[PDB]
Enzyme design. Structure first.
Site, PDB file in Angstrom:
ATOM      1  N   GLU A 199      -9.517   7.418  13.493  1.00 15.85           N
ATOM      2  CA  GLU A 199      -8.314   6.698  13.906  1.00 15.85           C
ATOM      3  C   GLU A 199      -7.085   7.277  13.204  1.00 15.85           C
ATOM      4  OE1 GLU A 199      -7.885   2.751  11.319  1.00 15.85           O
ATOM      5  OE2 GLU A 199      -9.810   2.774  12.372  1.00 15.85           O
TER       6      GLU A 199
ATOM      7  N   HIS B 107      -7.740  -1.736  14.645  1.00 11.33           N
ATOM      8  CA  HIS B 107      -7.821  -2.145  13.242  1.00 11.33           C
ATOM      9  C   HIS B 107      -6.956  -3.372  12.955  1.00 11.33           C
ATOM     10  CE1 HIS B 107      -8.854  -0.259   9.082  1.00 11.33           C
ATOM     11  NE2 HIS B 107      -8.840  -1.577   9.001  1.00 11.33           N
TER      12      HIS B 107
ATOM     13  N   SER C 265       0.822  -1.206   0.000  1.00 12.13           N
ATOM     14  CA  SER C 265       0.000   0.000   0.000  1.00 12.13           C
ATOM     15  C   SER C 265       0.860   1.262   0.000  1.00 12.13           C
ATOM     16  CB  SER C 265      -0.942   0.011   1.207  1.00 12.13           C
ATOM     17  OG  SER C 265      -0.220   0.118   2.421  1.00 12.13           O
TER      18      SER C 265
ATOM     19  N   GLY D 238      -8.382  -8.405  10.776  1.00 11.23           N
ATOM     20  CA  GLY D 238      -7.926  -9.270   9.703  1.00 11.23           C
ATOM     21  C   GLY D 238      -6.471  -9.685   9.809  1.00 11.23           C
ATOM     22  N   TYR D 239      -5.789  -9.213  10.847  1.00  4.58           N
ATOM     23  CA  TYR D 239      -4.374  -9.519  11.033  1.00  4.58           C
ATOM     24  C   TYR D 239      -4.139 -11.001  11.319  1.00  4.58           C
ATOM     25  CZ  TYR D 239      -2.151  -4.930  10.813  1.00  4.58           C
ATOM     26  OH  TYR D 239      -1.624  -3.734  10.383  1.00  4.58           O
TER      27      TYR D 239
ATOM     28  N   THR E 163     -18.559  -3.212   5.193  1.00  3.53           N
ATOM     29  CA  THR E 163     -18.717  -2.407   3.990  1.00  3.53           C
ATOM     30  C   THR E 163     -17.496  -1.519   3.785  1.00  3.53           C
ATOM     31  OG1 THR E 163     -19.876  -0.654   5.214  1.00  3.53           O
ATOM     32  CG2 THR E 163     -21.228  -2.367   4.203  1.00  3.53           C
TER      33      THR E 163
ATOM     34  N   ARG F 288     -14.955  -0.168   8.539  1.00  5.25           N
ATOM     35  CA  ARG F 288     -14.219   1.086   8.436  1.00  5.25           C
ATOM     36  C   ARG F 288     -14.729   2.054   9.502  1.00  5.25           C
ATOM     37  NH1 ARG F 288     -11.402   1.211   3.035  1.00  5.25           N
ATOM     38  NH2 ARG F 288      -9.287   1.498   3.878  1.00  5.25           N
TER      39      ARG F 288
ATOM     40  N   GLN G 276     -16.055  -9.945   0.206  1.00  6.22           N
ATOM     41  CA  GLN G 276     -15.102 -10.981   0.589  1.00  6.22           C
ATOM     42  C   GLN G 276     -15.228 -11.333   2.068  1.00  6.22           C
ATOM     43  OE1 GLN G 276     -13.088 -12.795  -1.267  1.00  6.22           O
ATOM     44  NE2 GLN G 276     -13.519 -11.755  -3.209  1.00  6.22           N
ATOM     45  N   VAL G 277     -15.196 -10.310   2.915  1.00  4.40           N
ATOM     46  CA  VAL G 277     -15.218 -10.501   4.358  1.00  4.40           C
ATOM     47  C   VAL G 277     -16.561 -11.034   4.855  1.00  4.40           C
ATOM     48  CG1 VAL G 277     -14.946  -9.401   6.592  1.00  4.40           C
ATOM     49  CG2 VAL G 277     -13.545  -8.652   4.664  1.00  4.40           C
TER      50      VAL G 277
HETATM   51  N1  LIG Z   1     -11.081  -4.360  10.277  1.00  2.96           N
HETATM   52  C1  LIG Z   1     -10.287  -5.163   9.556  1.00  2.96           C
HETATM   53  O1  LIG Z   1      -9.232  -5.873  10.035  1.00  2.96           O
HETATM   54  C2  LIG Z   1     -10.534  -5.244   8.188  1.00  2.96           C
HETATM   55  C3  LIG Z   1      -9.716  -6.038   7.392  1.00  2.96           C
HETATM   56  C4  LIG Z   1      -9.941  -6.124   6.023  1.00  2.96           C
HETATM   57  C5  LIG Z   1     -10.983  -5.409   5.444  1.00  2.96           C
HETATM   58  N2  LIG Z   1     -11.792  -4.572   6.228  1.00  2.96           N
HETATM   59  C6  LIG Z   1     -12.924  -3.841   5.616  1.00  2.96           C
HETATM   60  O2  LIG Z   1     -13.738  -4.748   4.842  1.00  2.96           O
HETATM   61  C7  LIG Z   1     -14.881  -3.983   4.247  1.00  2.96           C
HETATM   62  C8  LIG Z   1     -15.128  -5.400   3.652  1.00  2.96           C
HETATM   63  O3  LIG Z   1     -14.006  -5.734   2.823  1.00  2.96           O
HETATM   64  P1  LIG Z   1     -13.944  -6.654   1.498  1.00  2.96           P
HETATM   65  O4  LIG Z   1     -12.544  -7.050   1.238  1.00  2.96           O
HETATM   66  O5  LIG Z   1     -14.991  -7.691   1.612  1.00  2.96           O
HETATM   67  O6  LIG Z   1     -14.415  -5.577   0.374  1.00  2.96           O
HETATM   68  P2  LIG Z   1     -15.703  -5.868  -0.559  1.00  2.96           P
HETATM   69  O7  LIG Z   1     -15.891  -4.710  -1.457  1.00  2.96           O
HETATM   70  O8  LIG Z   1     -15.558  -7.217  -1.145  1.00  2.96           O
HETATM   71  O9  LIG Z   1     -16.947  -5.920   0.469  1.00  2.96           O
HETATM   72  C9  LIG Z   1     -17.978  -5.050   0.980  1.00  2.96           C
HETATM   73  C10 LIG Z   1     -19.253  -5.591   0.300  1.00  2.96           C
HETATM   74  O10 LIG Z   1     -19.646  -4.157   0.453  1.00  2.96           O
HETATM   75  C11 LIG Z   1     -20.926  -4.030  -0.162  1.00  2.96           C
HETATM   76  N3  LIG Z   1     -21.393  -2.640  -0.024  1.00  2.96           N
HETATM   77  C12 LIG Z   1     -20.989  -1.458  -0.475  1.00  2.96           C
HETATM   78  N4  LIG Z   1     -21.829  -0.536   0.002  1.00  2.96           N
HETATM   79  C13 LIG Z   1     -22.748  -1.144   0.752  1.00  2.96           C
HETATM   80  C14 LIG Z   1     -23.796  -0.682   1.443  1.00  2.96           C
HETATM   81  N5  LIG Z   1     -24.003   0.631   1.406  1.00  2.96           N
HETATM   82  N6  LIG Z   1     -24.604  -1.492   2.141  1.00  2.96           N
HETATM   83  C15 LIG Z   1     -24.340  -2.861   2.143  1.00  2.96           C
HETATM   84  N7  LIG Z   1     -23.240  -3.316   1.411  1.00  2.96           N
HETATM   85  C16 LIG Z   1     -22.467  -2.445   0.741  1.00  2.96           C
HETATM   86  C17 LIG Z   1     -19.995  -4.162  -1.391  1.00  2.96           C
HETATM   87  O11 LIG Z   1     -20.769  -3.987  -2.577  1.00  2.96           O
HETATM   88  C18 LIG Z   1     -19.842  -5.600  -1.101  1.00  2.96           C
HETATM   89  O12 LIG Z   1     -21.107  -6.266  -1.105  1.00  2.96           O
HETATM   90  C19 LIG Z   1     -13.848  -2.882   3.906  1.00  2.96           C
HETATM   91  O13 LIG Z   1     -13.998  -1.762   4.786  1.00  2.96           O
HETATM   92  C20 LIG Z   1     -12.568  -3.581   4.173  1.00  2.96           C
HETATM   93  O14 LIG Z   1     -11.475  -2.653   4.103  1.00  2.96           O
HETATM   94  C21 LIG Z   1     -11.592  -4.541   7.615  1.00  2.96           C
HETATM   95 CL   LIG Z   2      -9.232   0.433  -0.067  1.00  2.00          CL
END
Ligand SMILES: NC(=O)c1ccc[n+]([C@@H]2O[C@H](COP(=O)([O-])OP(=O)(O)OC[C@H]3O[C@@H](n4cnc5c(N)ncnc54)[C@H](O)[C@@H]3O)[C@@H](O)[C@H]2O)c1
Ligand SMILES: [Cl-]
Ligand SMILES: NC(=O)c1ccc[n+]([C@@H]2O[C@H](COP(=O)([O-])OP(=O)(O)OC[C@H]3O[C@@H](n4cnc5c(N)ncnc54)[C@H](O)[C@@H]3O)[C@@H](O)[C@H]2O)c1
Ligand SMILES: [Cl-]
Ligand SMILES: [Cl-]
Ligand SMILES: [Cl-]
Lengths: 379, 379
Positions: free
Chosen positions: B241, B258, B48, B261-262, B179, B212, B130-131
């Site tokens: 944050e 945060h 990144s 996912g680690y 999301t 997020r 994905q998550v």
């Molecule tokens: N906290 C952590 O350790 C951690 C780690 C990795 C990812 N994340 C956060 O994961 C979120 C999920 O990640 P991902 O890799 O699955 O990305 P992703 O884009 O695959 O997943 C999010 C899903 O979001 C849906 N979406 C978008 N807007 C929406 C809404 N308004 N209402 C409902 N769904 C909506 C997307 O279309 C999709 O269905 C991101 O914020 C990612 O950065 C958090």
């Molecule tokens: Cl991003």
């Protein structure tokens, strides 16, 4: 065939299955035992609910043996038993294993919460009887520094190296109590941890009392904790239990309703120990252990890839007991009527480290873990 | 022999060992990459910290492939990559496994602390990417009731059964967010959980945000928590944050910097996924997985005597991850300068359920545990 007549408390675990091998077993609730119940009875097996008085033995024409499935024996007039030739035995240390693993859990979680290593902390054991000596064995086994104090036993000729009290209270990081509760005698323990002692306890010192309630002045303990200098206290026993100071409760790092020594193994040892005593008393070859009576643990064995670190040690021990579980239930339920005693009565199927087998290679250092109480297996 | 010239971030884990099989590897810190660094470079592997601009590719005369070892790709101008025919790939879902096991830990500990069963609670997943989809898989795998909401994907033709938002916010016990953070578009997520929604959340409802920061209005979250009706909130991400509301912090059931996912596996998948992508891009047969690169877990396998209950499930999962660990460190250290980022940088050797093998008999019900993420072995 003639048999011994054995009167046993109805609710003594595994009592009928064991003692039926030794003769006729009569099962009656221990609280309702009368003098007539001991007519033609050769041996008596009881719990704490049965008081062995002059009244109870008024018609004990055949009584030769009395066993109590407890570590304590205050419910027994053993001066009475002695003067009329009745062999008496308890089950000393039957529930000492749980206490050691309770203390270790407390140390392990506090180490994680406060951010320190348990191998940096010196544990001072006040009371080196059944419970204290086993704890001393376990802690020294994994390489922690122990400090034993015991003025009575030292005066009786015990040649272990004992540390003097004021020295222990300063030299030790963690102070754990394992004494009886005594008001009189040469070495009384009532308010052994008093006001003057508590205020000389440092902010980086930990006080644990899983011995008896009145050993720590709870009012003084509260006053010490309300300074908020970082002093840390853990109570398994309270000065006026089942009643506790609801102001003190949220200041205690961990609070549990007198359940340190609890566990299926320890509970079974009560029956097991006096059974073996009576077996030996009859000249029988029969012998029993709690491991044979109990079902195997849910997770009876785990494998180790390498030598263990402090983190792995925490992971392993918490498979068996995590003090946060009981603490959470206790704080959550204590407001409910009689919850203190009901939580103990309906305690979960807790085990001990011996129920779990640690399998590894010769390079995994299991010998300390075995001394800690685990079963080991070098592949 | 001629080889592809591959430019890789110096600190990408296992990058040199893997990509050296595919050609000449040049290792340079990603923040200091200049235009000259891409002269005669066939493929670029970044994190990144490297921004893929017009500036960076100004002299990329041989660049045909760009891989970023991340789930996100905002640091990449992929409109630029597309218009000049450069194949681009990220590592989507590379760190989704940890989040699911993080959420489950939160559920598991809260179940113990508040005294309930996780199989009584309905989890509402907002964000089924994905998550979310992996979490939905894991929870359904062990027999929990899931609730998926995703207006964008539903509009795109995804035929999973989606639950409408206001329905989910009422029908679900646990609300977890997964999301992205968006201000515009048809379905913005900035303050998706706002004031009006929070005040209609019941006292027996749980809100988890490991998506997020700005998705939950933190100021509103605080106001909701200060009522003290028993509402429960957990934050892995904060609206501003590394800065957090120090009034909100002691009201959050769990707070972590945060790190959901680690984990070593997820971190390795970053390299692993783009490596496999580039392998396929070259027509090579080489293939790599994080399990082969990492050392085996400290406790790589445990055995089960019988079928698992909810308690055993807690015991097993906490071998890998216990959210109380990070929570304790975070609260203990956050006052220290830059502790938010430093805690992430020096994160412990955390694993995942796949690193542990659960061995049992056919009567132990491991199939749900396998779907949860564990490796299983029927004896
Ligand atoms: N906290 C952590 O350790 C951690 C780690 C990795 C990812 N994340 C956060 O994961 C979120 C999920 O990640 P991902 O890799 O699955 O990305 P992703 O884009 O695959 O997943 C999010 C899903 O979001 C849906 N979406 C978008 N807007 C929406 C809404 N308004 N209402 C409902 N769904 C909506 C997307 O279309 C999709 O269905 C991101 O914020 C990612 O950065 C958090
Ligand atoms: Cl991003
Ligand atoms: N909290 C629990 O779950 C739990 C369980 C079992 C026992 N206990 C408490 O264990 C204490 C330890 O039990 P035990 O079975 O080892 O009994 P014990 O008599 O074997 O042990 C206490 C040791 O106390 C020493 N002692 C007495 N007065 C002392 C003093 N003033 N200073 C230092 N040592 C003193 C005794 O002489 C002996 O050395 C008792 O209160 C026992 O009831 C607590
Ligand atoms: Cl029985
Ligand atoms: Cl006693
Ligand atoms: Cl490498």
């Amino acid at each position: 065939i003639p048999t011994m007549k054995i009167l046993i408390d109805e609710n003594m675990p595994y009592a009928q299955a064991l003692f039926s091998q030794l003769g006729e077993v009569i099962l009656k609730p221990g609280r309702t035992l009368t003098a007539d119940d001991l007519i033609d009875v050769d041996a008596l097996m009881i719990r704490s609910v049965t008081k062995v008085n002059d009244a109870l033995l008024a018609k004990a024409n055949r009584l030769k043996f009395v066993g109590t499935a407890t570590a304590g024996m205050d419910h027994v007039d053993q001066a009475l038993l002695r003067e009329r030739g009745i062999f008496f035995t308890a089950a000393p240390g039957c529930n000492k294993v749980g206490v050691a693993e309770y203390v270790f859990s407390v140390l392990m979680v506090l180490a994680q919460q406060q951010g320190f290593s348990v191998f940096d902390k010196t544990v001072g054991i006040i009371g080196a009887g059944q419970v204290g000596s086993y704890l001393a064995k376990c802690l020294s086994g994994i390489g922690m520094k122990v400090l034993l104090n015991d003025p009575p036993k030292q005066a009786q000729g015990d040649e272990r190296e004992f540390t003097e009290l004021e020295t222990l209270l300063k030299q030790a990081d963690v102070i754990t109590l394992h004494t009886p509760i005594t008001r009189g005698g040469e070495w009384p323990t009532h308010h052994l941890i008093d006001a003057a002692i508590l205020e000389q306890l440092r902010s980086d010192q930990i006080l644990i009392n899983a011995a008896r309630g009145p050993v720590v002045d709870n009012a003084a303990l509260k006053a010490r904790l309300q300074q908020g200098d970082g002093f840390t206290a853990v109570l398994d026993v309270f000065e006026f239990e089942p009643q506790v100071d609801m102001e003190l409760l949220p200041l205690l790092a961990f609070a549990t309703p007198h359940i340190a020594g609890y566990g299926l193994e320890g509970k079974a040892r009560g029956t097991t120990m006096i059974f073996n005593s009576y077996c030996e008393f009859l000249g029988s070859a029969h012998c029993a252990n709690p491991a044979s009576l109990l079902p195997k643990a849910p997770v009876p064995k785990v494998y180790l890839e390498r030598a263990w670190d402090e983190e792995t040690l925490r992971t392993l021990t918490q498979i068996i007991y995590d003090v946060r579980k009981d603490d959470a239930q206790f704080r959550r339920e204590i407001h409910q009527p009689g919850a203190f005693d009901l939580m103990r009565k309906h305690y979960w199927d807790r085990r001990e480290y011996s129920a779990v087998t640690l399998a590894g290679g010769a390079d995994c250092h299991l010998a300390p873990l075995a001394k800690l109480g685990f079963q080991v297996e070098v592949c």
